[PDB]
Structure formats: structure tokens, C-alpha cells
Amino acid sequence: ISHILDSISQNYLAQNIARQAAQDAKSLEFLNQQLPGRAVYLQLLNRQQELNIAKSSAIGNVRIIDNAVTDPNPVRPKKTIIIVIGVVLG
Amino acid sequence: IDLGRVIGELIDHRKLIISITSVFTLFAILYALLATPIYETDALIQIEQSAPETALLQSRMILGKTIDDLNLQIQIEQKYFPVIGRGLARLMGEKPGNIDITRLYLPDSDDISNNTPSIILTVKDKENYSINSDGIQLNGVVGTLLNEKGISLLVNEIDAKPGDQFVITQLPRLKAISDLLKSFSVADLGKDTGMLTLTLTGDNPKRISHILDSISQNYLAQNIARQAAQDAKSLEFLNQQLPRAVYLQLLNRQQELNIAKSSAIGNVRIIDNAVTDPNPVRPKKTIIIVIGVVLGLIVSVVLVLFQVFLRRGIESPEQLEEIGINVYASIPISEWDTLLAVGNPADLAVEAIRGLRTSLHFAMMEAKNNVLMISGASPSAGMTFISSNLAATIAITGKKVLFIDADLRKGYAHKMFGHKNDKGLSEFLSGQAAAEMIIDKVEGGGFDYIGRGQIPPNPAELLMHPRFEQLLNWASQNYDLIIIDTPPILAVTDAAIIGRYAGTCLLVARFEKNTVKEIDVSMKRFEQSGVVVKGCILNGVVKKASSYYRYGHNHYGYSYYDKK
Ligand SMILES: Nc1ncnc2c1ncn2[C@@H]1O[C@H](COP(=O)(O)OP(=O)(O)O)[C@@H](O)[C@H]1O
Ligand SMILES: [Mg+2]
Known part of the structure; x- marks a missing residue:
């Protein structure tokens, strides 16, 4: 890139x-x-x-x-926000 | 209404919900x-x-x-x-x-x-x-x-x-x-x-x-x-x-x-x-199918929400007992011209009728006579199903039972028992038959029965004849129990005439077809004519999750056999 x-x-x-x-x-x-001319x-x-x-x-x-x-x-995946959402959603 | 009520309604109408939602999603997919x-x-x-x-x-x-x-x-x-x-x-x-x-x-x-x-x-x-x-x-x-x-x-x-x-x-x-x-x-x-x-x-x-x-x-x-x-x-x-x-x-x-x-x-x-x-760029298949699902769900929900708020029929025997009506049995729908108590004695509906047989042995004592009249509010509520099967479950207990088909209008008990259709109850009431010539035996039964005979032009006026009380007074000496099948009371007045000579009268209420007020109107129409209705029999109960959440019990009953 x-x-x-x-x-x-x-x-x-x-x-x-x-x-x-x-x-x-x-x-x-x-x-x-x-x-x-x-x-x-x-x-x-x-x-x-x-x-x-x-x-x-x-x-x-x-x-x-x-x-x-x-x-x-x-830049992606944002591991912290993914795991945190995994906890909160769970 | 609460969470349990609405969830039970969604579980009961799951076929309607699934079908409507699947139709909407199918249309959305076919369009996309x-x-x-x-x-x-x-x-x-x-x-x-x-x-x-x-x-x-x-x-x-x-x-x-x-x-x-x-x-x-x-x-x-x-x-x-x-x-x-x-x-x-x-x-x-x-x-x-x-x-x-x-x-x-x-x-x-x-x-x-x-x-x-x-x-x-x-x-x-x-x-x-x-x-x-x-x-x-x-x-x-x-x-x-x-x-x-x-x-x-x-x-x-x-x-x-x-x-x-x-x-x-x-x-x-x-x-x-x-x-x-x-x-x-x-x-x-x-x-x-x-x-x-x-x-x-x-x-x-x-x-x-x-x-x-x-x-x-x-x-x-x-x-x-x-x-x-x-x-x-x-x-x-x-x-x-x-x-x-x-x-x-x-x-x-x-x-x-x-x-x-x-x-x-x-x-x-x-x-x-x-x-x-x-x-x-078009058609956007995902938003079309997603809208098809969501639109199908909200349509299924409002239809279920309407059918719930619009239905008035009985949902449990508790509704009848809130008014003070004794419900002696709740008979489930038998998914199985035959007598159910004879064709399938182990049926779940026959097990519920046996519970009615023992409940009646305690309710029919202290009565004037051994005559039991079974009527109801509306036609096709199960009065002939219950009375004919109740007579079959009491006949196996060694008792002499007489089933009188006093539905001189649409009685078909002779077709259900095997018939020598001549000389029924009509021919007796009109004087052209003796009491001995009208009693016939149910083949696979165990009780005698009197058919309605030929449909008379004056059924309500025939039942007012003094011969009808003479037949009951004669039969009350040769039988341990007389069960009289009658037309519905909210249709005709025949049951109010017959109920004068019956010591016990029970109403049959259809599960969802009859209303609580419809059964209350029936019991008060009998009392107005001097007939005391002992109680009610809820018929045609089906397993419903809404009853289990609204009330504690669905009133359907359990199956109890050794599987072999
Ligand atoms: N609990 C039930 N289970 C299965 N079938 C039933 C039940 N109740 C009634 N039926 C059937 O529905 C029909 C209506 O019964 P019927 O005796 O003719 O009604 P009624 O005499 O009250 O007008 C009958 O064919 C009967 O076999
Ligand atoms: Mg009938």
C-alpha cells in the first residue's frame, strides 16, 4: 500500500x-x-x-x-473495542 | 396483559406468524x-x-x-x-x-x-x-x-x-x-x-x-x-x-x-x-428482503394482536368458575358413527370422561331421581359426544344405563349406535309405540338406548305430553341411570321441558366456540323455567401455551400409560 x-x-x-x-x-x-508572408x-x-x-x-x-x-x-481490527463490545453484548 | 400472556399468544399462533412472515419474505425474495x-x-x-x-x-x-x-x-x-x-x-x-x-x-x-x-x-x-x-x-x-x-x-x-x-x-x-x-x-x-x-x-x-x-x-x-x-x-x-x-x-x-x-x-x-x-444499483436485494421480513413480522403481530383482543370464547374453566359455574370436567379434543369410549378406551378424552363419571357419582347423589339431562348453549358443542360417551363409561362399570335421544330435531344417536330406526321416542310420544318397543341395545356398548324416531312436526309439543314423564318413571325403575341427550337451550326450548323430569342437569360448553356469557345466559334460562343446572362440562379443550401463562394451568391433562 x-x-x-x-x-x-x-x-x-x-x-x-x-x-x-x-x-x-x-x-x-x-x-x-x-x-x-x-x-x-x-x-x-x-x-x-x-x-x-x-x-x-x-x-x-x-x-x-x-x-x-x-x-x-x-488500524483494523480494533481489538480492544471488539473484545469490550463482546463482553458488554454478552 | 404481560410478558407471559403475549409470549403464550405468540407461541400459540406460531403457525400463523410463520406462514405470514414466510409469505412476505417469499414475495420480497421473488421481487429482489x-x-x-x-x-x-x-x-x-x-x-x-x-x-x-x-x-x-x-x-x-x-x-x-x-x-x-x-x-x-x-x-x-x-x-x-x-x-x-x-x-x-x-x-x-x-x-x-x-x-x-x-x-x-x-x-x-x-x-x-x-x-x-x-x-x-x-x-x-x-x-x-x-x-x-x-x-x-x-x-x-x-x-x-x-x-x-x-x-x-x-x-x-x-x-x-x-x-x-x-x-x-x-x-x-x-x-x-x-x-x-x-x-x-x-x-x-x-x-x-x-x-x-x-x-x-x-x-x-x-x-x-x-x-x-x-x-x-x-x-x-x-x-x-x-x-x-x-x-x-x-x-x-x-x-x-x-x-x-x-x-x-x-x-x-x-x-x-x-x-x-x-x-x-x-x-x-x-x-x-x-x-x-x-x-x-437497483434492486437493493438486502434492504428489500430485510423489509420483507420486518413487514411480515409486524403484520403477523398485529393480526395476532387483533385475534387476541377480539376473541370472546372460553379459554379455561376458571372463566366459568369466576361466575359461580361448577365445571365438572374438561374434555380435550379427541384427535383419534363410532363411540370413542368403545373405539379407543385409552383415549385422553375418555380418561377425562371417566373423571366426569366419578365426579357425577358424587354430584348425582342426593338427587330426586337417576335421570341425568345433558344440554348446552349452542349446537355442535359436544352434548351428544359427551352424553353418549359418558353412558359408555358408566356402562362398563356394571350399571344399567339408558341413553334417551330426546333431540327430536337433529338427533343422530341411532346412526351412531346401529339402528332399527322405527319406533323411536317420537312414535312413543305420539302414542303409536309402546315403551318396550322403543328401547334398543348398543352393540359395542353395554347400555340400552331410545332413538328419536321420525322427526315430528311438533318436537317441543310432543315432549310436553304426559307420556314422556311416564317413560322416565318407568325407565327410572329398570335402569340405574338414564342419560337424556337434548337440543341446545339457546336454539330451542326442548331441554327446558325435559329438564323438569331430570334430577341432574349438566351443560356442555364448547372450548372456544362458546362464551362465558353464553353459558351464563343458558343456565339462567333453565332456572327461569324451573330447571336447576348442577354444573357445566367444558368440551373440546386444546393445548395452549397462553392458558399456561395467563392461568397456572392449561387444563388439557396428561397422558399416563406404560408405552407398551
Ligand atoms: N371433545 C371432542 N373431541 C373430539 N370430537 C368431538 C369432541 N366433541 C365433539 N366432537 C365431535 O364434534 C361433533 C359435534 O358433536 P355433537 O354431539 O354432534 O354436538 P351437539 O349434540 O352438542 O350439537 C361430533 O361429530 C363429535 O364427534
Ligand atoms: Mg346432539
């Missing part, structure tokens, strides 16, 4: 940075599909790199302060 | 098993709020687009003749047949009520099929479309077995939308987030996921399109406004608006495409 919670954290970490870039990635996606072609090249840098540097909103560790004491 | 399972699929939508988006998802514009895409106005239902044929077919492991229809145009009757025309498709094989709307039979084949009789139908990929029928309904577009809108719900799940949780329920697990995907995609296309439209409208005017430095400046704005429209991206977003939860 500690390996799973580490995977969930890292996937959400890798995924979150990607999400903010997704708005600029879709713009970059259509720009690459739209790369063919020449002065405008240079203006597109300036937008071409600006979308490359924005996507690459767009990592934010998620920080993992602590990695997953397992509490060695089980 | 035969009800069609309804699944639920969910998608997650994340808007870039989320208030106006909900009403646009549930609109007839978005939902109506899904009905057109998936042809949700073509309703196909497997044909099952009963209201349970679908559920049991699922239990038998039969996979439900499904046919894919891509084109359906019915003749559109559109009459006063049936705005939804319907046909019935009967699968003949994997390839061809039949159609019958109103008896008109039409043969169709997968592939080749059908345009006949004003009926357009295109069936693709019949996945079923031959013989299966299907009801194909072409419901109106609004009805298809209203059905979808009824099962389709939208939520926010955070009340602030841009997340929308689209859920959809239905009996088909695969179909509802295709529908929720169509709804989501349509909503996604529309949402993004609107954001795209603003930039498409500006780029539209730019294309309309292009007429050299400003021209190049507009060219930069030209592509900057091309990129935006191309990028698109609605504020709304999809994070999870629709998948169906394989566990049905």
Missing part, C-alpha cells in the same frame, strides 16, 4: 504539471500542424518557441511534502 | 430476484461555476442530439408474456437477445392515444426474420432494407436465437428525451469545483455507457465550440476586414486568431469517460 500510494502521488505529480501545459500544448499542437512565418516561429518553453516550464500546484510510509500498527 | 437489475454509469466533467453547465447538459438541445445520434427513439424490448418472464429468464442463465436497428419508420398511426406505433419482430434464424404490426406478416432479411406497407425497417446483426420475439416501438423524439432525462443526473461533487459527475442509469449496462459518452462528447463539443466561436467571430470579421504595415499587423493577428480557434479547449473538461458499474 506504500508502493501504491507512492505511485498515486507520483502519477498525480507528473500528471498535474502536464495538465497546466495542456492548454499550451494544444496550442502548440495546432501550431505544428499549421506551420506552412515570410514575416508572418517568422512571427509564427516566435510563437513556436514560446509555446515550447511555456509547456516545459509549466510545473505547478502540486508538491509532495512526505512520501508514503505505512503505520506498522494496524 | 425477478426485478430487472438497473446499472449505473458515470462520467466526470471538469469545467475550467458549474451551475449553468448543469442546466445545459439536461437540456433538450444536448440530450436531443444524443437521441438522434444513437437512434434512442427506436425502442426494442425482448418479448416476455408475463410480468416475471424477463426476471426468471435471467435466472435461468439465458442471455438476453439484442437486435441492432439503424433505420425504422413505422406507418405512424398517431391515433387518439397510441402516439407510439409498435411492431413485433420474430427471429426466424441468424439472417432473416418476420414482422407483424397488426397481423400483417412481412418477412425481412438482415442487410436489405424493407419498404413495404408504409413500414421502413433496417435490422442489422440479429444476435438472438430463433423463435424470440421483440417489441419494436418508435416513440416520439420528446418521449425519448424525457426517458433519458429521467435517468440522467448531473452533480458537482464539490459545490465549488469545475468538476461535473454525470451519472446515467439503465437496464442495459453497455448501452448506458454509450449514451453517457454521447452526452459527454456532445456537451464537450458544444462547450469548446462556444469558446471557439468568440475567436471564430473575431477572425471572421478579420477575414472580412483585410484590405501594408497594418496589413502585416493584421496578418499577425490573423494567425493568432487561427491558433486560438484551432486550439479550442472548452472550460469544461472530461477526466473520465463513461464506464458502467457492473454491480447493479
Whole structure:
């Protein structure tokens, strides 16, 4: 469960940075599909790199302060409340 | 009432309680098993709020687009003749047949009520099929479309077995939308987030996921399109406004608006495409069966609670003795035209009649004569059962007993003893028979008996004849005991006439059929006519736990024999 919670954290970490870039990635996606007067072609090249840098540097909103560790004491079953209820119910 | 009373009542009515509860649980289980399972699929939508988006998802514009895409106005239902044929077919492991229809145009009757025309498709094989709307039979084949009789139908990929029928309904577009809108719900799940949780329920697990995907995609296309439209409208005017430095400046704005429209991206977003939860959400079998048990119990309890508060019959001899009525015996029901005292002398009811025989030997002493009249309140209370068996238990003790069947109305003692039916008590009272010709011997008995004879038209007036007292005065010298069986006193007055010549009179009370006031009314009707009723005989007692808790004793009696 500690390996799973580490995977969930890292996937959400890798995924979150990607999400903010997704708005600029879709713009970059259509720009690459739209790369063919020449002065405008240079203006597109300036937008071409600006979308490359924005996507690459767009990592934010998620920080993992602590990695997953397992509490060695089980949370269930709660032996004391079970035995106590066993006495009282009996 | 207390704990013992109610627990005894529950023990006594345990058959009723168990049967009613089991019927309720059986109905609950049959519903939980035969009800069609309804699944639920969910998608997650994340808007870039989320208030106006909900009403646009549930609109007839978005939902109506899904009905057109998936042809949700073509309703196909497997044909099952009963209201349970679908559920049991699922239990038998039969996979439900499904046919894919891509084109359906019915003749559109559109009459006063049936705005939804319907046909019935009967699968003949994997390839061809039949159609019958109103008896008109039409043969169709997968592939080749059908345009006949004003009926357009295109069936693709019949996945079923031959013989299966299907009801194909072409419901109106609004009805298809209203059905979808009824099962389709939208939520926010955070009340602030841009997340929308689209859920959809239905009996088909695969179909509802295709529908929720169509709804989501349509909503996604529309949402993004609107954001795209603003930039498409500006780029539209730019294309309309292009007429050299400003021209190049507009060219930069030209592509900057091309990129935006191309990028698109609605504020709304999809994070999870629709998948169906394989566990049905309805019917909830556990809560249905549990309610079936609990509802069956509270119904069984109120019925038992009613029968307890409504019953008025006698429950124990104590009820009769609270009024001052001596109960000389309590005869149990004999579970065994025969005399019980002769057929089964060891019966528990004969053992109780022997206890009456010894109780009478002490009560019939100090009486005027040896004549014992046995009457009762209501018919079929056991007056003939007790008097005839009491005569049999006194006959084995070596006494001469005469059993007179003075029930000139419905007396059947002659049938119970073996009869020469001629010359009974009627023929004697009417003067057409001598006292010696009417006495007959019980074969397996030990006592003589006088039958009623032919039913007279005036039974109560015959018993008033002075011949009846002459017969009793004559028989009282040739017999040690005369037992007179009579009709019930609350029916006719015959017993009050006969009771004038009987030294001892006993009433027979039926266990649950007679009431305490009914027996008190009977004893006071005798006393009003000069007949002193010595006591009562409670008849037909059954073993009941309620009597053991209400009173200390159930008054049934114990079995005492050596088992061999
Ligand atoms: N304690 C009993 N046990 C078994 N059967 C009984 C008992 N009392 C009556 N019966 C039966 O129920 C019927 C009613 O008895 P019956 O003598 O005809 O009633 P009555 O003369 O009071 O109208 C009879 O067939 C009788 O055999
Ligand atoms: Mg009778």
C-alpha cells in the first residue's frame, strides 16, 4: 500500500504539471500542424518557441511534502473495542 | 396483559406468524430476484461555476442530439408474456437477445392515444426474420432494407436465437428525451469545483455507457465550440476586414486568431469517460428482503394482536368458575358413527370422561331421581359426544344405563349406535309405540338406548305430553341411570321441558366456540323455567401455551400409560 500510494502521488505529480501545459500544448499542437508572408512565418516561429518553453516550464500546484510510509500498527481490527463490545453484548 | 400472556399468544399462533412472515419474505425474495437489475454509469466533467453547465447538459438541445445520434427513439424490448418472464429468464442463465436497428419508420398511426406505433419482430434464424404490426406478416432479411406497407425497417446483426420475439416501438423524439432525462443526473461533487459527475442509469449496462459518452462528447463539443466561436467571430470579421504595415499587423493577428480557434479547449473538461458499474444499483436485494421480513413480522403481530383482543370464547374453566359455574370436567379434543369410549378406551378424552363419571357419582347423589339431562348453549358443542360417551363409561362399570335421544330435531344417536330406526321416542310420544318397543341395545356398548324416531312436526309439543314423564318413571325403575341427550337451550326450548323430569342437569360448553356469557345466559334460562343446572362440562379443550401463562394451568391433562 506504500508502493501504491507512492505511485498515486507520483502519477498525480507528473500528471498535474502536464495538465497546466495542456492548454499550451494544444496550442502548440495546432501550431505544428499549421506551420506552412515570410514575416508572418517568422512571427509564427516566435510563437513556436514560446509555446515550447511555456509547456516545459509549466510545473505547478502540486508538491509532495512526505512520501508514503505505512503505520506498522494496524488500524483494523480494533481489538480492544471488539473484545469490550463482546463482553458488554454478552 | 404481560410478558407471559403475549409470549403464550405468540407461541400459540406460531403457525400463523410463520406462514405470514414466510409469505412476505417469499414475495420480497421473488421481487429482489425477478426485478430487472438497473446499472449505473458515470462520467466526470471538469469545467475550467458549474451551475449553468448543469442546466445545459439536461437540456433538450444536448440530450436531443444524443437521441438522434444513437437512434434512442427506436425502442426494442425482448418479448416476455408475463410480468416475471424477463426476471426468471435471467435466472435461468439465458442471455438476453439484442437486435441492432439503424433505420425504422413505422406507418405512424398517431391515433387518439397510441402516439407510439409498435411492431413485433420474430427471429426466424441468424439472417432473416418476420414482422407483424397488426397481423400483417412481412418477412425481412438482415442487410436489405424493407419498404413495404408504409413500414421502413433496417435490422442489422440479429444476435438472438430463433423463435424470440421483440417489441419494436418508435416513440416520439420528446418521449425519448424525457426517458433519458429521467435517468440522467448531473452533480458537482464539490459545490465549488469545475468538476461535473454525470451519472446515467439503465437496464442495459453497455448501452448506458454509450449514451453517457454521447452526452459527454456532445456537451464537450458544444462547450469548446462556444469558446471557439468568440475567436471564430473575431477572425471572421478579420477575414472580412483585410484590405501594408497594418496589413502585416493584421496578418499577425490573423494567425493568432487561427491558433486560438484551432486550439479550442472548452472550460469544461472530461477526466473520465463513461464506464458502467457492473454491480447493479437497483434492486437493493438486502434492504428489500430485510423489509420483507420486518413487514411480515409486524403484520403477523398485529393480526395476532387483533385475534387476541377480539376473541370472546372460553379459554379455561376458571372463566366459568369466576361466575359461580361448577365445571365438572374438561374434555380435550379427541384427535383419534363410532363411540370413542368403545373405539379407543385409552383415549385422553375418555380418561377425562371417566373423571366426569366419578365426579357425577358424587354430584348425582342426593338427587330426586337417576335421570341425568345433558344440554348446552349452542349446537355442535359436544352434548351428544359427551352424553353418549359418558353412558359408555358408566356402562362398563356394571350399571344399567339408558341413553334417551330426546333431540327430536337433529338427533343422530341411532346412526351412531346401529339402528332399527322405527319406533323411536317420537312414535312413543305420539302414542303409536309402546315403551318396550322403543328401547334398543348398543352393540359395542353395554347400555340400552331410545332413538328419536321420525322427526315430528311438533318436537317441543310432543315432549310436553304426559307420556314422556311416564317413560322416565318407568325407565327410572329398570335402569340405574338414564342419560337424556337434548337440543341446545339457546336454539330451542326442548331441554327446558325435559329438564323438569331430570334430577341432574349438566351443560356442555364448547372450548372456544362458546362464551362465558353464553353459558351464563343458558343456565339462567333453565332456572327461569324451573330447571336447576348442577354444573357445566367444558368440551373440546386444546393445548395452549397462553392458558399456561395467563392461568397456572392449561387444563388439557396428561397422558399416563406404560408405552407398551
Ligand atoms: N371433545 C371432542 N373431541 C373430539 N370430537 C368431538 C369432541 N366433541 C365433539 N366432537 C365431535 O364434534 C361433533 C359435534 O358433536 P355433537 O354431539 O354432534 O354436538 P351437539 O349434540 O352438542 O350439537 C361430533 O361429530 C363429535 O364427534
Ligand atoms: Mg346432539
